[PDB]
Amino acid sequence: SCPNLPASINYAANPKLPDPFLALSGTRLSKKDQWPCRKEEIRQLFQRYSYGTFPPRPESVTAAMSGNALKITVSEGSKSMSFSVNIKLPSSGAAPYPAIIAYGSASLPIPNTVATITYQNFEMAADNGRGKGKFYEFYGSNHNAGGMIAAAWGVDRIIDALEMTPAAKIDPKRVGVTGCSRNGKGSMIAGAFVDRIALALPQEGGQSAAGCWRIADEIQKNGTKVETAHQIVNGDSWFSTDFSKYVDTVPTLPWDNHMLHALYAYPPRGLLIIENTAIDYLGPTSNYHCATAGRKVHEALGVKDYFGFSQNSHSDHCGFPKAQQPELTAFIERFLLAKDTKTDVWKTDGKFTIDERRWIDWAVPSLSGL
Ligand SMILES: *[C@@H]1O[C@H](CO)[C@@H](O[C@@H]2O[C@H](CO)[C@@H](O[C@@H]3O[C@H](CO)[C@@H](O)[C@H](O[C@H]4O[C@H](CO)[C@@H](O)[C@H](O)[C@@H]4O)[C@@H]3O)[C@H](O)[C@H]2NC(C)=O)[C@H](O)[C@H]1NC(C)=O
């Protein structure tokens, strides 16, 4: 349906967030029916420069309920791998149930109307181990995928297995995803690459997730210690070994993380970013300005209200404040509990400067076809 990227891309150093509506072809999007092919371009850019290859569904996926365990087996040629996820069914409403996949564990309050699928994402592909995890046992240790995109592949397989196994009692069309800190990152990427996810809730994922690389670079340049591209490729195997060629030349990247958010605008799905203005290393002003740029794609495609942003000041990392509950309730209501509640939430309590034009030198086009 869409072409692959040129063998090589020449992108002139740009100190602002690249126009998400500007195809590498050269033509700027003016028609809705062009967006799908730009969306793949973006997906392919992320995999080449930062994430590694997000593989397709393997030749076999099979699943099997075994008590509360959903045991998912896959194979490709003679190779086979199994990974198990715990499902804790809720105590309110009737099957098939809406669910949330938690990277390791939730730090959001999940209502008693929504199932809790507990995904062992570091078990799938390790936190700080190059080529370690089920993913790499299956595909090879030398496979160029990073532990973030390999975890996201596991979420694609989790949903394949819920489509195959009504026994699990989970509506496949209403599976959310969430995580905090490192799993804010994972959950954000899972939701960006798995189109079938109904709602992503990344919490305090900061840079790589909510924040843009260019703004992290400028936060650093201004004196405050923050999670820059240069920093993030060190304590972990989250990104492909290729990412560390580019960390020092961010302005020449034909993309930024605002285009990760853009992947959520088609097919339209819920994205509430929950963030913390108090912790410097997240880059509070990056998160806000980066998100605000990402939502421009949602705005063009008339699905603005499917992308929520909430930034709150709290000393404790990953402690959900009660202040952010109405916003979380609303997004769970609309996209998981199939209720009809409004979700235009875009707020920070942060006291930094809010200047869009600093990062966004491009206009939201009127897309015809919608
Ligand atoms: C990194 O630090 C640099 C420091 O240079 C910083 O870039 C600068 O940001 C400031 C803050 O916005 C810019 O200064 C602005 O300039 C306009 C006029 O040119 C002023 O009117 C703005 O002020 C208003 O805001 C005040 C408080 O909100 C109001 O009380 C007041 O009445 C005005 O309405 C403001 O001074 C400056 O132009 C840029 N400089 C450059 C080089 O672009 C950058 O913001 C910092 N980056 C990060 C990541 O923090």
Numbering used by the authors: 20 to 389
What's the paper's own text on this?
Glucuronyl esterases (GEs) are carbohydrate-active enzymes that are able to cleave ester linkages between the alcohols of the aromatic polymer lignin and 4-O-methylglucuronic acid (4-O-MeGlcA) moieties on glucuronoxylan in the plant cell wall, a linkage which contributes to the recalcitrance of plant biomass. Several more experimental structures have since been obtained, totaling eight structures (three from fungal species and five from bacterial species) from diverse organisms. However, one of the putative GEs from Lentithecium fluviatile, LfCE15C, lacks many of the additional sequence characteristics of a fungal CE15-B as described in Ernst et al.. As highlighted in Fig. 1(a), a highly conserved glutamate residue in a substrate-interacting helix-containing loop (here denoted αL) is a glycine in LfCE15C, while a conserved substrate-interacting tryptophan is instead a tyrosine.
The active-site structure is stabilized by one of the disulfide bonds (Cys199–Cys337), also conserved in Cip2, that joins the strand bearing the serine nucleophile to the loop bearing the catalytic histidine. The glutamate residue can presumably be functionally equivalent to glutamine, so this difference is unlikely to be of functional importance. In contrast, the characteristic glutamate of fungal CE15-B further along in the αL region (Glu324 in CuGE), which interacts with O2 of the GlcA moiety as well as the xylan backbone, is substituted by a glycine in LfCE15C (Gly254). Furthermore, an otherwise extremely conserved tryptophan in the whole CE15 family (Trp358 in OtCE15A and Trp368 in CuGE and CE15-B, phenylalanine or tryptophan in fungal CE15-A), which interacts with GlcA O2 and is located at the end of β-strand 7 in the loop following the canonical acid residue position, is found to be a tyrosine in LfCE15C. Although in principle this is a conservative substitution, the hydrogen bond between the NH group of tryptophan and O2 of the GlcA moiety will almost certainly be lost given the conformation of the corresponding tyrosine in the active site.
